[PDB]
């Protein structure tokens, strides 16, 4: 038992999606689409959280320069 809590639930979550939707064919279904949206919007939001924190340190580091 090793690596992370996260990537291991990535090995996982990925393995599930395929086992439900991406099973032979990969059939697009109303609640498949839903599934991707909920997931694909998240990543944008997480990214936007690291986006705010990134700009933040910049203003901070921008600021240490000068008195």
């Amino acid at each position: 038992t090793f690596e992370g809590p996260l990537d291991l639930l990535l090995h996982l979550i990925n393995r599930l999606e395929i086992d439900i939707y991406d099973i032979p064919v990969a059939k697009i279904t109303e609640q498949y689409l839903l599934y991707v949206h909920t997931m694909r919007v998240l990543e944008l939001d997480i990214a936007s959280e690291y986006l705010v924190m990134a700009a933040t340190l910049l203003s901070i580091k921008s600021r240490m320069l000068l008195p």
Binding site: L33, S48, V52, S62, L65
Partner: protein, 345 residues
């Protein structure tokens, strides 16, 4: 989750306790003063909205089971104070959300259905931005920018010393480094806007990926109700998407593809009901109430609409209030409400 019950005392038209027991899925309300039950929940939830002695309190209770049975109850007086109680212990309001965000319910009246159709097609996209889940990005992106101008102004303030420093051991070691470091800083800055681009690409990619889905169901649901015609949602300024607008065009059977309103009728009604079933497909919610919405529809219309909810059951809990026949017998459980007001089956 699925609402258990509503306790009602002293609210608007409500004299006695009239408690309402609220099945899972479909539920119903009849009257010519009944209108006020939505308002109750609407109010308890916190969204906007002669023969007996006047009253100084109003108390409404939400039985509402979650994954336990969780009571949400709200009071007001003259002077007056207002209290908040989860399972009858007094609480704060931020405290109301919680399991709400860890949107939620939709509350639909005849006016809200005009709220939409009327609104200048600019602001409307907000409804799609919301379903495209793209609003959160837009917030943080916005603050990262306001944060970015900060780091920017500090550079300008830095550019200033750099020219003053054009000329002991102090100067050269600093200037060598100062412009060394600032050069590194504008590199960071640059690529952040880079990032906003890509994220704006995904934001829009996110937007119309969803916008396309809402288009499909809009036309597909339109027919299931009108039987049929074409329905599309246009885009004013196809590009400039983030601030672009959304038109709504519908041709009910008969009259050709043309503009809403000059359609008139309860056609212009139906199209929106059609629209709403479809937005509900992309970001669904397990609470839906409908306040006398089908009153412009003719029968088989009223049927097909009522049909849609008949079929929309296992999805979300539906409480619709109307005097209409199509729904009433196609309903599950009815409570009569008659003006002071009273209710039961």
């Amino acid at each position: 989750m699925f609402l258990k019950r509503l306790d009602v005392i002293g609210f608007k038209s409500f004299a006695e306790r009239i408690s309402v027991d609220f099945v899972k899925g479909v539920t119903a309300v009849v009257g010519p003063g009944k209108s006020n039950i939505t308002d109750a929940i609407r109010w308890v939830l916190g969204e906007q909205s002669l023969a007996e002695v006047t009253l100084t309190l109003d108390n409404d209770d939400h039985f509402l089971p979650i994954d336990h049975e969780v009571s949400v109850t709200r009071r007001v007086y003259r002077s007056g104070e207002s209290e908040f109680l989860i399972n009858n212990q007094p609480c704060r309001l931020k405290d109301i959300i919680d399991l709400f965000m860890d949107e939620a319910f939709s509350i639909i009246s005849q006016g809200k259905v005009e709220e939409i159709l009327s609104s200048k097609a600019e602001d409307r996209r907000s409804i799609f931005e919301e379903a495209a889940g793209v609003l959160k990005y837009k917030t943080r992106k916005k603050k990262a920018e306001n944060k970015l101008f900060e780091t920017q102004d500090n550079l300008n303030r830095v550019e200033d010393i750099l020219h003053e420093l054009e000329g002991f051991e102090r100067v050269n070691e600093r200037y060598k480094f100062l412009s060394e470091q600032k050069e590194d800083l504008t590199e960071a800055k640059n690529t952040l806007f880079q990032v906003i681009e890509e994220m704006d690409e995904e934001m829009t990619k996110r937007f119309n990926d969803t916008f396309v889905q809402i288009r499909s169901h809009f036309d597909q649901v339109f027919r299931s109700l009108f039987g049929g015609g074409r329905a599309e949602l246009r885009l004013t300024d196809p590009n400039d998407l983030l601030h672009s607008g959304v038109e709504i065009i519908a041709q009910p059977p008969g009259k050709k593809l043309q503009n809403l309103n000059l359609l008139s009728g309860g056609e212009r009604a139906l199209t929106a009901i059609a629209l709403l079933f479809s937005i509900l497909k992309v970001r669904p919610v397990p609470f839906c109430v409908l306040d006398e919405v089908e009153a412009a529809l003719d029968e088989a219309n009223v049927f097909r609409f009522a049909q849609y909810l008949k079929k929309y059951s296992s999805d979300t809990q539906f409480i619709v209030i109307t005097h209409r026949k199509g729904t009433m017998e196609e309903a599950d459980v009815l409570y009569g409400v008659t003006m002071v007001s009273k209710v039961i089956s």
